Ligand binder design. Structure first.
Ligand SMILES: CC[C@H](C[C@H](O)[C@@H](N)CN1CC(=O)N(c2ccccc2Cl)CC1(C)C)C(=O)N[C@@H]1[C@@H]2C[C@@H]3C[C@H]1C[C@@](O)(C3)C2
Ligand SMILES: *[C@@H]1O[C@H](CO)[C@@H](O)[C@H](O)[C@H]1NC(C)=O
Length: 340
């Protein structure tokens, strides 16, 4: 592990509080793609020009076309990524990738099979996996590992800032710092929690409290910190119980309350390491109206994450929006600080 003197940032756009994505270029000359930087996974991929146009999701996204890149290097090994919420499939290629002004030779999936659900609902084209190599499919070095190798970054860490969605363009949607954190976007001190184990961005959670009565995760539980998840999530059975405590109605994909009931909802607290992380209802209610005649969705969802990573809660965009997040690969921990 060699360290340098550099920090790089990636400017993110915020689509509807649910997808935070930045721009990368692949190939010579660069082909640009909108991508999510996803700590829940470790593979890079973008849709391929070899994706059959019978996948409509391929009709509606940018396609990487190897035949137009002079730095491409073929490989071709089959690759399937089976996330908890959908799957993609294709084959591995290598090309040069530009991210935050850093150029790195990276092996990545060209995706030729991309389901309309969920992918038709993606504003982004691809994914940049930010997790450990232990979780990379095909044993492919993740992009951050390859950048670390160049010995240019000041610290073996990266940090996420997710903004609250603005209508006004001079609000940046968010920011990733590779090799550091950005003190403009947090205040107070970081508090850290150790990873249970290297290989996964998952920490122990000591309790989940709702208001001043209800207690979940009473004996302890897992918290995956997932920058590529829209929401905070829990196991179906946990969320069943959290939602009971809030007076919420279950639908197929989400929970809702009558919009007028939203601001009366208690705080929700997450006990991580030394500290309680508290969200008020404004942090977890999509308060689109104050009417009793309208439903408001909640940014806390049920999700069963498979083993071995699950069963687990996941702290996604709903959480990061309040808490500036640092991922420390040197010391295998995660730090949180109040975002600003
Ligand atoms: C362990 C949880 C982890 C979660 C996952 O990284 C998601 N956060 C990714 N998101 C899903 C999603 O649904 N997105 C989405 C959001 C809004 C609209 C449309 C879309 Cl497609 C965006 C992305 C970034 C693709 C995972 O399954 N990881 C899987 C990876 C890594 C490792 C653990 C799991 C099984 C593996 O075989 C090994 C592959
Ligand atoms: C793809 O990459 C792996 C990684 O070392 C390699 O062993 C394999 O032979 C490659 N396949 C081809 C056809 O280039």
């Amino acid at each position: 592990l060699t360290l340098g003197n550099t920090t790089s940032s990636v400017i993110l756009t915020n689509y509807m509080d649910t997808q935070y994505y930045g721009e990368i270029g692949i190939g010579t000359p660069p082909q640009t793609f909108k991508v999510v930087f996803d700590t829940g996974s470790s593979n890079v991929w973008v849709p391929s020009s070899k994706c059959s146009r019978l996948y409509t999701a391929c009709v509606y996204h940018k396609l990487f076309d190897a035949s137009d890149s002079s730095s491409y290097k073929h490989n071709g090994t089959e690759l399937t990524l089976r996330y908890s919420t959908g799957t993609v499939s294709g084959f591995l290629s290598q090309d040069i990738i530009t991210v935050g002004g850093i150029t790195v030779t990276q092996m990545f999936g060209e995706v030729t099979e991309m389901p309309a659900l969920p992918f038709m609902l993606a504003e982004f084209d691809g994914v940049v996996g930010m997790g450990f190599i232990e979780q990379a499919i095909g044993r492919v070095t993740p992009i951050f590992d390859n950048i670390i190798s160049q010995g240019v970054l000041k610290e073996d860490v990266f940090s996420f800032y997710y903004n609250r969605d603005s209508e006004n363009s001079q609000s940046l949607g968010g920011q990733i710092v590779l090799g550091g954190s950005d003190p403009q976007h947090y205040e107070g001190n970081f508090h850290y929690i150790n990873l249970i184990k290297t290989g996964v961005w998952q920490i122990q959670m000591k309790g989940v409290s709702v208001g001043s009565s209800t207690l979940l995760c009473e004996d302890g539980c897992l918290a995956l910190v997932d920058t590529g998840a829209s929401y905070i999530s829990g196991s179906t059975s946990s969320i069943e119980k959290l939602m009971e405590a809030l007076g919420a109605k279950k639908r197929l994909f989400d929970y809702v309350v009558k919009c007028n009931e939203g601001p009366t909802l208690p705080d929700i607290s997450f006990h991580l390491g030394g500290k309680e992380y508290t969200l008020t209802s404004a942090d977890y209610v999509f308060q689109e109206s104050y009417s009793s005649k309208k439903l408001c969705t909640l940014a806390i969802h049920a999700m069963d994450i498979p083993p071995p990573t699950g069963p687990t809660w996941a702290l996604g965009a709903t959480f990061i929006r309040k808490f500036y997040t640092e991922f420390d690969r040197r010391n295998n921990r995660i730090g949180f600080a109040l975002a600003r």
